[PDB]
Amino acid sequence: METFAFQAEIAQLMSLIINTFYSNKEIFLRELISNSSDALDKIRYESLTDPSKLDSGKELHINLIPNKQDRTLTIVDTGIGMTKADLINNLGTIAKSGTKAFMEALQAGADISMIGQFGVGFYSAYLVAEKVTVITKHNDDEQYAWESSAGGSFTVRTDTGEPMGRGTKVILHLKEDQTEYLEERRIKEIVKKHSQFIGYPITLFVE
Ligand SMILES: O=C(N[C@@H]1c2ccccc2-c2c(-c3nc4ccncc4[nH]3)cccc21)c1ccncc1
């Protein structure tokens, strides 16, 4: 396990998301499903030129998995996944520029719900989660686990968990007062409201 420091802009956005009073927390789900949909679009588009890109899995889907015992909500996709370089470097570049643009927009009067327009919608996970664990497998790299409970750092390690084939799992370790996001009726309501037209099958798992 390697530990890394967030750059100042992203650390400030994470604190803003964690500290600001904002009741419309449900938008986190739309943001993570949109990220998954974008990753699925990417691998699907690559497979049009190279069909072997799907040798790691032909199914293109999104699963939403609640676990009441562990207090986790997991968003699983079979999209392109992220390499180690994406996790540490490339997405750090995106997080920096997107945070700067988002912070400028917020000062102008934009809403926290507009976060996705800035390419940093993933960070909306911190509206409901105390810790986010990301398990990911890209065709060009090994399976990795990225994790952060904010506080200015994140970790990255090779993951020894169940091999995924290809794709990403965003595991939300929910805050104690955010357990409504584990309820079937609540997740179904949110998906219908914000994610009804996503071009991949979304399966809401139950317990
Ligand atoms: O949401 C996704 N990716 C996430 C995403 C989207 C935008 C910006 C950063 C990140 C990010 C990061 C990350 N943020 C950082 C800030 C500073 N330094 C390094 C960083 N790495 C780590 C794991 C997952 C994601 C995604 C979901 C499904 N498939 C592909 C990507």
The CATH number that applies at residue 74 is 3.30.565.10
Tell me, rounded to whole angstroms, the distance of Cα 24 from its chain centroid: 18
Q: Which of 91, 94, 96, 172 to mutate to test the pocket of ligand 1 (most atoms within 8 A of CB)?
A: 91
Q: Which atom of ligand 1 is nearest to the CA of 122?
A: 1
CA-nearest residue for atom 20, ligand 1, is: 92
* DSSP β-bridge partners for residue 2: 156
**Helix (H) or strand (E) segment spanning residue 148:** strand 144-148
100, 9 Cβ separation under 8 angstroms? yes
Q: What is the resolution of this structure in A?
A: 1.7
Judging by DSSP bridges, how do beta strands 202-204 and 167-174 pair with one another?
unpaired
Identity of the residue numbered 138: H
Nearest CA, atom 1, ligand 1: 122
Where do runs of H (alpha helix) occur along 3-67?
A: 8-19, 27-49
CA 130 – ligand 1 centroid, Å = 16
Angstrom distance (rounded) from CA 105 to CA 151:
24
Distance CA 39, CA 122 (A): 13
Structural domains in the chain (count):
1
Nearest CA-CA partner of 64 in 182, 160, 179: 182
Q: What strand order describes the sheet that includes 167-174?
A: 2-5, 153-158, 144-148, 129-137, 167-174, 72-77, 62-67, 202-204
- For atom 26 of ligand 1, the residue with the nearest CA is 35
Cα gap 143→148, rounded to integer Å: 17
Residues touching ligand 1 (Cβ under 6 Å) are 6, 10, 35-36, 39, 77, 79, 82, 87-88, 91-92, 94-95, 119-120, 122, 134, 146, 168
> What's the gap in Å between 87 CA and the centre of ligand 1?
6
From 64, 99, 122, give the residue whose CB has the most ligand 1 atoms within 8 Å, as the site to mutate: 122
- The distance of Cα 81 from the centroid of its chain, to the nearest Å, equals 11
Alpha helices by DSSP H, 50-131: 84-85, 91-108
CA dist., res. 99 & res. 3, Å (int): 21
Atom of ligand 1 nearest to the CA of 79: 29
Nearest CA to ligand 1 atom 5: 122
3-state helix, strand, coil in the chain (%, to 5): 45, 25, 30
Alpha-carbon distance 40 to 77, whole Å? 7
CB 140 within 8 A of CB 50: no
Would the CA dihedral through 128, 134, 119, 49 be positive or negative?
negative
Contacts of 117 (CB under 8 A, 6+ apart): 102, 105
Q: Which domain holds residue 55?
A: 1-207
